[PDB]
Design an enzyme around this catalytic site. Structure first.
Site, PDB file in Angstrom:
ATOM      1  N   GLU A  11      -2.267  -5.555  -8.466  1.00  0.00           N
ATOM      2  CA  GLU A  11      -2.509  -4.365  -7.629  1.00  0.00           C
ATOM      3  C   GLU A  11      -3.283  -4.609  -6.342  1.00  0.00           C
ATOM      4  OE1 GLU A  11      -1.236  -1.572  -8.220  1.00  0.00           O
ATOM      5  OE2 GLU A  11      -0.720  -1.712 -10.315  1.00  0.00           O
ATOM      6  N   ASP A  20       0.889   3.408  -1.638  1.00  0.00           N
ATOM      7  CA  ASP A  20       1.414   2.433  -2.540  1.00  0.00           C
ATOM      8  C   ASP A  20       2.851   2.101  -2.184  1.00  0.00           C
ATOM      9  OD1 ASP A  20       2.845   4.367  -3.784  1.00  0.00           O
ATOM     10  OD2 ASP A  20       1.805   4.298  -5.695  1.00  0.00           O
TER      11      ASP A  20
END
Ligand SMILES: CCCc1ccccc1N
Ligand SMILES: [Cl-]
Ligand SMILES: [Cl-]
Length: 162
Positions: A11, A20
């Site tokens: 991540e 994202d």
């Protein structure tokens, strides 16, 4: 290697609000803030999660704190799920990290519909499950990451994370 390090690798870490891979507002170590496209909703959500007026920015410690909560929530979500629980408990420790990764990235929901893969993993048909898992939008949108998780399920080792 452990779940935190693994996810920190997948991540990354950003201290300012970001978008994202699906274009959603997120912060820290993959912590989703909102699906809405209003930055302001996102900032409101950040302030509420942190407990103070962030103005879209957090500290490393704050990020890590959200990360702790989020890993915990994920596992607990798995444990509470009837379709998930039995599978998860049948796996060894490495493979369990791969399960948590997925749930962290996609929700208990997403994972709960990987029925055929669920079964294969439960039966320990590694290579079969690996192929099945790649036939998914998840693999097609985020192939490098999906490759590493799949290898992890496939082998039961940390090799993909080197
Ligand atoms: C394909 C689903 C793999 C899985 C099994 C048990 C718990 C969580 C997850 N992600
Ligand atoms: Cl919070
Ligand atoms: Cl990827």
């Amino acid at each position: 290697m452990n779940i935190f390090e693994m996810l920190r690798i997948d991540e990354g870490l950003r201290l300012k609000i970001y978008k994202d891979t699906e274009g959603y507002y997120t912060i820290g170590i993959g912590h989703l803030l909102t699906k809405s496209p209003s930055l302001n909703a996102a900032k409101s959500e950040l302030d509420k999660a942190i407990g103070r007026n962030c103005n879209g920015v957090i500290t490393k410690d704050e990020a890590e704190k959200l990360f702790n909560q989020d890993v915990d929530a994920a596992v607990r979500g798995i444990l509470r799920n009837a379709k998930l629980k039995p599978v998860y408990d049948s796996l060894d420790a490495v493979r369990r990290c791969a399960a948590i990764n997925q749930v962290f990235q996609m929700g208990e929901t997403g994972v709960a519909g990987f029925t055929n893969s669920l079964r294969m993993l439960q039966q320990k048909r590694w290579d079969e499950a690996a192929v099945n898992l790649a036939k998914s939008r998840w693999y097609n949108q985020t192939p490098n990451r999906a490759k590493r998780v799949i290898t992890t399920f496939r082998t039961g080792t940390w090799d993909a994370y080197k």
